[PDB]
Design an enzyme around this catalytic site. Structure first.
Site, PDB file in Angstrom:
ATOM      1  N   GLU A  89      -5.151 -11.300  -2.243  1.00 42.65           N
ATOM      2  CA  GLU A  89      -6.053 -11.294  -1.074  1.00 42.65           C
ATOM      3  C   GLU A  89      -7.502 -11.319  -1.483  1.00 42.65           C
ATOM      4  O   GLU A  89      -8.376 -10.639  -0.927  1.00 42.65           O
ATOM      5  CB  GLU A  89      -5.814 -10.017  -0.208  1.00 42.65           C
ATOM      6  CG  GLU A  89      -4.313  -9.752  -0.007  1.00 42.65           C
ATOM      7  CD  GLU A  89      -4.040  -8.580   0.990  1.00 42.65           C
ATOM      8  OE1 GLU A  89      -5.016  -8.026   1.561  1.00 42.65           O
ATOM      9  OE2 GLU A  89      -2.838  -8.224   1.151  1.00 42.65           O
ATOM     10  N   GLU A 104       0.778  -1.221   0.000  1.00 49.12           N
ATOM     11  CA  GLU A 104       0.000   0.000   0.000  1.00 49.12           C
ATOM     12  C   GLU A 104       0.798   1.252   0.000  1.00 49.12           C
ATOM     13  O   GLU A 104       0.471   2.127   0.814  1.00 49.12           O
ATOM     14  CB  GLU A 104      -0.956  -0.031   1.183  1.00 49.12           C
ATOM     15  CG  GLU A 104      -1.941  -1.263   1.071  1.00 49.12           C
ATOM     16  CD  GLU A 104      -2.952  -1.322   2.181  1.00 49.12           C
ATOM     17  OE1 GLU A 104      -2.984  -0.448   3.059  1.00 49.12           O
ATOM     18  OE2 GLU A 104      -3.740  -2.301   2.175  1.00 49.12           O
TER      19      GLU A 104
HETATM   20  O1  LIG Z   1      -6.652  -5.668  16.246  1.00 50.46           O
HETATM   21  C1  LIG Z   1      -5.895  -6.125  15.136  1.00 50.46           C
HETATM   22  C2  LIG Z   1      -6.852  -6.302  13.940  1.00 50.46           C
HETATM   23  O2  LIG Z   1      -7.302  -5.046  13.469  1.00 50.46           O
HETATM   24  C3  LIG Z   1      -6.141  -7.034  12.824  1.00 50.46           C
HETATM   25  O3  LIG Z   1      -7.005  -7.247  11.752  1.00 50.46           O
HETATM   26  C4  LIG Z   1      -6.259  -7.612  10.567  1.00 50.46           C
HETATM   27  C5  LIG Z   1      -6.084  -6.370   9.679  1.00 50.46           C
HETATM   28  O4  LIG Z   1      -5.363  -6.754   8.498  1.00 50.46           O
HETATM   29  C6  LIG Z   1      -6.108  -7.733   7.713  1.00 50.46           C
HETATM   30  O5  LIG Z   1      -5.364  -8.010   6.572  1.00 50.46           O
HETATM   31  C7  LIG Z   1      -5.253  -6.890   5.716  1.00 50.46           C
HETATM   32  C8  LIG Z   1      -6.554  -6.668   4.929  1.00 50.46           C
HETATM   33  O6  LIG Z   1      -6.395  -5.452   4.157  1.00 50.46           O
HETATM   34  C9  LIG Z   1      -5.331  -5.532   3.176  1.00 50.46           C
HETATM   35  O7  LIG Z   1      -5.261  -4.303   2.565  1.00 50.46           O
HETATM   36  C10 LIG Z   1      -3.991  -5.851   3.870  1.00 50.46           C
HETATM   37  O8  LIG Z   1      -2.923  -6.039   2.943  1.00 50.46           O
HETATM   38  C11 LIG Z   1      -4.134  -7.133   4.738  1.00 50.46           C
HETATM   39  O9  LIG Z   1      -2.917  -7.350   5.460  1.00 50.46           O
HETATM   40  C12 LIG Z   1      -6.319  -9.013   8.497  1.00 50.46           C
HETATM   41  O10 LIG Z   1      -7.180  -9.877   7.726  1.00 50.46           O
HETATM   42  C13 LIG Z   1      -7.050  -8.704   9.807  1.00 50.46           C
HETATM   43  O11 LIG Z   1      -7.088  -9.879  10.580  1.00 50.46           O
HETATM   44  O12 LIG Z   1      -5.702  -8.310  13.308  1.00 50.46           O
HETATM   45  C14 LIG Z   1      -4.656  -8.173  14.280  1.00 50.46           C
HETATM   46  C15 LIG Z   1      -5.187  -7.448  15.516  1.00 50.46           C
HETATM   47  O13 LIG Z   1      -4.092  -7.188  16.391  1.00 50.46           O
HETATM   48  O1  LIG Z   2      -7.028  -0.354   5.067  1.00 52.42           O
HETATM   49  C1  LIG Z   2      -7.357  -0.712   3.740  1.00 52.42           C
HETATM   50  C2  LIG Z   2      -8.817  -0.386   3.424  1.00 52.42           C
HETATM   51  O2  LIG Z   2      -9.027   1.027   3.466  1.00 52.42           O
HETATM   52  C3  LIG Z   2      -9.161  -0.884   2.023  1.00 52.42           C
HETATM   53  O3  LIG Z   2     -10.505  -0.642   1.803  1.00 52.42           O
HETATM   54  C4  LIG Z   2     -10.920  -0.157   0.511  1.00 52.42           C
HETATM   55  C5  LIG Z   2     -11.299   1.320   0.586  1.00 52.42           C
HETATM   56  O4  LIG Z   2     -11.684   1.782  -0.732  1.00 52.42           O
HETATM   57  C6  LIG Z   2     -12.825   1.066  -1.283  1.00 52.42           C
HETATM   58  O5  LIG Z   2     -13.022   1.473  -2.592  1.00 52.42           O
HETATM   59  C7  LIG Z   2     -12.624  -0.435  -1.292  1.00 52.42           C
HETATM   60  O6  LIG Z   2     -13.882  -1.026  -1.589  1.00 52.42           O
HETATM   61  C8  LIG Z   2     -12.122  -0.955   0.060  1.00 52.42           C
HETATM   62  O7  LIG Z   2     -11.738  -2.329  -0.022  1.00 52.42           O
HETATM   63  O8  LIG Z   2      -8.924  -2.296   1.914  1.00 52.42           O
HETATM   64  C9  LIG Z   2      -7.538  -2.651   2.128  1.00 52.42           C
HETATM   65  C10 LIG Z   2      -7.073  -2.196   3.551  1.00 52.42           C
HETATM   66  O9  LIG Z   2      -5.666  -2.365   3.714  1.00 52.42           O
END
Ligand SMILES: O[C@@H]1[C@@H](O)[C@H](O[C@@H]2CO[C@@H](O[C@@H]3CO[C@@H](O)[C@H](O)[C@H]3O)[C@H](O)[C@H]2O)OC[C@H]1O
Ligand SMILES: O[C@@H]1[C@@H](O)[C@H](O[C@@H]2CO[C@@H](O)[C@H](O)[C@H]2O)OC[C@H]1O
Ligand SMILES: [Cl-]
Ligand SMILES: [Cl-]
Ligand SMILES: [Zn+2]
Ligand SMILES: [Zn+2]
Ligand SMILES: [Zn+2]
Ligand SMILES: [Zn+2]
Ligand SMILES: [Zn+2]
Ligand SMILES: [Zn+2]
Length: 371
Positions: free
Chosen positions: A257, A151
């Site tokens: 993902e 990101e």
């Molecule tokens: O409290 C913490 C939780 O908020 C945490 O949730 C994880 C947040 O990251 C998730 O994976 C991300 C999803 O969004 C993408 O953009 C990222 O690349 C991913 O890494 C994950 O699925 C949630 O479990 O979990 C840990 C707690 O400490």
């Molecule tokens: O933290 C990130 C989120 O903000 C992200 O969520 C996206 C926000 O913009 C929307 O258009 C999308 O639908 C939504 O998934 O997802 C990834 C996470 O790392």
């Protein structure tokens, strides 16, 4: 097509074995659950850690490294002949605050003195290099694919102005790839991972960033498209253009993902799985059918498709599944309808091809067939 147990069902990784690997994100405790282990062995040939390989999990305090949880995923992968992806060496979330503190303990983003900002930049980059070095030296022989940065481009099309960028500028991205190649060698494959890679202006900004970095000789091998998508957006035509444009730069593409939400954005979720109408699963299955036919069309440009979970009983999308209630206490799922209060993160999404009882969904039949 019947809702049979996914343990008696045709293997999803075998259906796609000549096209790309099929992966799942996991937590270590799922490796102690008989159903999840059975699912990973039956249907997947690639794995990634949902959370235990993030910066704050691996080095919570400077010099204190926790590879135990990560090691459990790697050992399971090796015992089961699965590829492994490392997620992720650098990110602005789930990252320990100590990286960004100066020698006197103050946040480096607060520094105004030019000479001290340059010293902070070098200290941060040194810490970044050591974090990457320690991790890659341990796993370079076991883990083939790496999300080196996650990101780093903002949704507005500018680089993300996180503390990494505020303190070190574009060099943190360059140092990260440089360091992973230096300690891992040429056989590990390095990726820049992001969401909404199909969306402008972000898409063009990422394209330009990677084009420039490669022109400068920074070692980047591919793009990870997180693919947290919905039933109708982004369109397959836009996904295809995106994958094609990065492939034209000589980059591999991995779908890293994947989850297909039942909702829009912001989501108005049902409160339980039971309440999601059958029609939603058929709408989702048609989306999966078109998505995977597209991935097959582009298989020479995609080496892996990884789902962000195993089955619908566990998905991070539930943390985004807000449930809206009207004045009478009825659930509201229409984005334009009246509502009185919202319960954030309390609803249920259903994003995969495997249900919460480990039985196959209509989306599974849609992608296991050859139509
Ligand atoms: O409290 C913490 C939780 O908020 C945490 O949730 C994880 C947040 O990251 C998730 O994976 C991300 C999803 O969004 C993408 O953009 C990222 O690349 C991913 O890494 C994950 O699925 C949630 O479990 O979990 C840990 C707690 O400490
Ligand atoms: O933290 C990130 C989120 O903000 C992200 O969520 C996206 C926000 O913009 C929307 O258009 C999308 O639908 C939504 O998934 O997802 C990834 C996470 O790392
Ligand atoms: Cl989760
Ligand atoms: Cl069910
Ligand atoms: Zn297999
Ligand atoms: Zn149920
Ligand atoms: Zn392929
Ligand atoms: Zn989770
Ligand atoms: Zn069921
Ligand atoms: Zn199909």
């Amino acid at each position: 097509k019947p809702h049979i147990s996914a343990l008696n069902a045709p293997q999803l990784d075998q259906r796609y074995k000549n096209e790309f690997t099929i992966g799942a994100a996991v937590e270590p405790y799922q490796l102690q659950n008989e159903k999840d282990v059975q699912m990973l062995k039956r249907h997947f040939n690639s794995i990634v850690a949902e959370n235990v390989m993030k910066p704050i999990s691996i080095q919570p305090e400077e010099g204190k490294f926790n590879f135990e949880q990560a090691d459990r995923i790697v050992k399971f992968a090796k015992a089961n002949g699965m590829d492994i992806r490392f997620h992720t060496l650098v990110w602005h979330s789930q990252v320990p605050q100590w990286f960004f503190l100066d020698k006197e303990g103050k946040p480096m983003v607060n520094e105004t003195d030019p000479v001290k900002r340059e010293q902070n930049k070098q200290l941060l980059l040194k810490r970044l290099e050591t974090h990457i070095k320690t991790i890659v030296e341990r796993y370079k022989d076991d883990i083939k694919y790496w999300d080196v940065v996650n990101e780093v481009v903002g949704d507005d099309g500018k680089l993300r102005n996180s503390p990494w960028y505020q303190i070190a500028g574009i060099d943190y991205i360059k140092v990260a790839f440089q360091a992973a190649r230096k300690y891992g060698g040429d056989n590990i494959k390095l990726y820049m991972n992001d969401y909404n890679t199909e969306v402008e202006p972000k898409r063009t900004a990422l394209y330009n960033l990677v084009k420039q970095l490669k022109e400068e000789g920074v070692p980047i091998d591919g793009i990870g498209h997180q693919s947290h998508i919905q039933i109708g957006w982004p369109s397959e035509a836009e996904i295809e253009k995106t994958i094609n444009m990065f492939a034209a730069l000589g980059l591999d593409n991995q779908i890293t993902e994947l989850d297909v939400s039942m909702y829009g954005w912001p989501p108005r979720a049902y409160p339980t799985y039971d309440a999601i109408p059958k029609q939603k699963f058929l709408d989702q299955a048609a989306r999966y059918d078109r998505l995977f036919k597209l991935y097959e069309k582009l298989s020479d440009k995609i080496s892996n498709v990884t789902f962000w979970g195993i089955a619908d009983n566990h998905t991070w999308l539930d943390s985004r599944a807000d449930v809206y209630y009207d004045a009478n206490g009825n659930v509201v799922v229409d984005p334009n309808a009246p509502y009185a209060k919202v319960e954030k993160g309390k609803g249920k999404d259903a994003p995969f091809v495997f249900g919460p009882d480990y039985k196959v969904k209509p989306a599974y039949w849609a992608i296991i067939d050859h139509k």
